[PDB]
Design a protein around this ligand. Structure first.
Ligand SMILES: [Zn+2]
Ligand SMILES: [Zn+2]
Lengths: 99, 101, 117
């Protein structure tokens, strides 16, 4: 269904923020389409009842205080899609504040 | 025993008829994430908004998350009560509760 | 968030309450008696500070500067007028009282400058 298509297109649109994908020189549409699959293969319901995963990956890629996460995608998508704290442990300043 | 009162910083009720131009500037950029790909129809979100902003100390002190709070509130009242919340990685822990039409 | 306050009807001087413009989807203020009505200024219906974040300065008053039962310090010249003598005391408000935070006021007339450090 198009539900997966639009939300992984939005994942690709999140990966490109700040031209970091171009500074690194990587193709982000493949990455977004793979990230949505990595999420779905764990949250395996058709309507993605827990699409908090996708919404949060989108936003956290767009989080300007943790651009290093946007840079990393070298931790592959298969790991990113599952991360607790929505992967913002990599921010390492919010992580220290929470600690 | 930890109720919504212990983790909340402040609460406010607003007439916020359009989240894509929400009355709170602090929330507009993160509300856009929830409204640029809405998982709900703009016609069922009531324009009346109850904003609850949480203390990161009282949330992190006990590892609480925006997801838990929204899930809990949706269960305590129900279909008549929509809940939106800021991302756990964002700077401000904010909840945006709206009556569902 | 701001702070909404009571407004009185120009017709009956009774308190005015917020009402939504069901058509234009905006906020209105209306008298519960007469149809006196006006468009609302805050977009906020209500606020409730759970933390009780408060501008203690609003409840502090300069008149306390002459209280003879108030401790005075020559050690803290007035930030406004520089006068050496200043009275100091704690913020007797439940959350401010729990914080035990001190407030200083100048012991100089018409100055009455009150500050916290
Ligand atoms: Zn009236
Ligand atoms: Zn002075």
């Amino acid at each position: 269904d198009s539900v997966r298509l639009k939300c992984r297109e939005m994942l690709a649109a999140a990966l490109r923020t700040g031209d970091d994908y171009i500074a690194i020189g990587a193709d982000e549409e493949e990455l977004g389409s793979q990230i949505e699959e990595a999420i779905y293969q764990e949250i395996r319901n058709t309507d993605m009842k827990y699409k908090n995963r996708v919404r949060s990956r989108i936003s956290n890629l767009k989080d300007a205080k943790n651009p290093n996460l946007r840079k990393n995608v070298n931790i592959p998508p298969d790991l990113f899609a599952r991360m607790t704290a929505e992967e913002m442990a990599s921010d390492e300043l919010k992580e220290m504040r929470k600690n | 025993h930890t109720t919504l009162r212990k983790v909340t910083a402040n609460t406010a009720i607003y007439y916020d008829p359009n989240p894509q131009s929400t009355v709170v500037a602090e929330d507009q950029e993160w509300v856009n994430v929830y409204y640029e790909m809405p998982d709900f129809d703009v016609a069922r979100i009531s324009p009346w908004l109850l904003r609850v902003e949480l203390d990161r100390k009282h949330m992190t002190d006990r590892k609480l998350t925006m997801e838990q709070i929204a899930e809990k509130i949706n269960a305590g009242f129900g279909d008549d009560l929509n809940c939106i919340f800021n991302d756990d990685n964002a700077e401000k822990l904010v909840l945006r509760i709206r009556i569902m039409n | 968030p701001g702070f909404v306050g009571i407004r009185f009807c120009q017709e009956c001087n009774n308190m005015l309450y917020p009402k939504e413009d069901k058509e234009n989807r905006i906020l209105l203020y209306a008298c519960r008696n007469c149809d006196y009505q006006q468009e609302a200024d805050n977009s906020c219906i209500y606020v409730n500070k759970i933390t009780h974040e408060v501008d203690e300065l609003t409840q502090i008053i300069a008149d306390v500067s002459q209280d003879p039962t108030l401790p005075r310090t020559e050690d803290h010249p007035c930030q406004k007028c520089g006068h050496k003598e200043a009275v100091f005391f704690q913020s007797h408000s439940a959350r401010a009282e729990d914080a035990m935070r001190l407030y200083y006021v100048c012991t100089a007339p018409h100055c009455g400058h009150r500050w916290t450090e």
